[PDB]
Amino acid sequence: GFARLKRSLLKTKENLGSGFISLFRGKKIDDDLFEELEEQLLIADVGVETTRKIITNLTEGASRKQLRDAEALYGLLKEEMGEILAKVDEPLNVEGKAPFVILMVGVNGVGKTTTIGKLARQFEQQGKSVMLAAGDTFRAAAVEQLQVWGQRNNIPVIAQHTGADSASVIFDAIQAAKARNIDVLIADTAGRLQNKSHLMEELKKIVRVMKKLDVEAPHEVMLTIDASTGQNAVSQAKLFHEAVGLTGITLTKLDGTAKGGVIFSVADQFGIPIRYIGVGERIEDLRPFKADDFIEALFAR
Please report, in range form, the residues annotated as the binding site for GTP: 106-113, 188-192, 252-255
Q: Would you say 9 or 102 has its CB closer to ligand [N+]?
A: 102
Instruction: Give least dist CB 216 to ligand [N+], A.
Output: 8
Q: Would you say 93 or 151 has its CB closer to ligand [N+]?
A: 151
Q: Would you say 25 or 152 has its CB closer to ligand [N+]?
A: 152
Residues 98 and 282 sit within 8 Å (Cβ to Cβ): no
Instruction: Give least dist CB 132 to ligand [N+], A.
Output: 14
Instruction: Give least dist CB 113 to ligand [N+], A.
Output: 19
Element (H, E) at 264: helix 262-270
Its sign, for the CA torsion 115, 104, 278, 182, is negative
Residues that bind ligand [N+] (CB under 6 A): 151-152, 154, 247
Instruction: Give least dist CB 220 to ligand [N+], A.
Output: 7
Binding site: what residues are annotated? 106-113, 188-192, 252-255
73-112 burial, b at 16+ Cβ within 10 Å, e below that, comes to bbebbbebbbebbeebbeebebeebebbbbbbbbbbebbb
Q: Would you say 240 or 264 has its CB closer to ligand [N+]?
A: 240
- 166: which residues sit within 8 A by CB, 6+ positions away? 135, 136, 137, 189, 190, 202, 205, 206
Q: Would you say 246 or 279 has its CB closer to ligand [N+]?
A: 246
d(Cα 165, Cα 53) in Å, to the nearest integer? 44
- DSSP letter, residue 61: H
d(Cα 227, Cα 280) in Å, to the nearest integer? 12
Q: Would you say 113 or 247 has its CB closer to ligand [N+]?
A: 247
Cα Rg of the chain (Å, integer): 21
Q: Which residues pair with 157 in a beta bridge?
A: 132
Instruction: Give least dist CB 153 to ligand [N+], A.
Output: 7
Nearest residue to the partner ligand [N+], using Cβ: 247
Element (H, E) at 221: strand 220-226
Instruction: Give least dist CB 152 to ligand [N+], A.
Output: 5
Strands 286-288 and 274-278, sheet pairing:
antiparallel
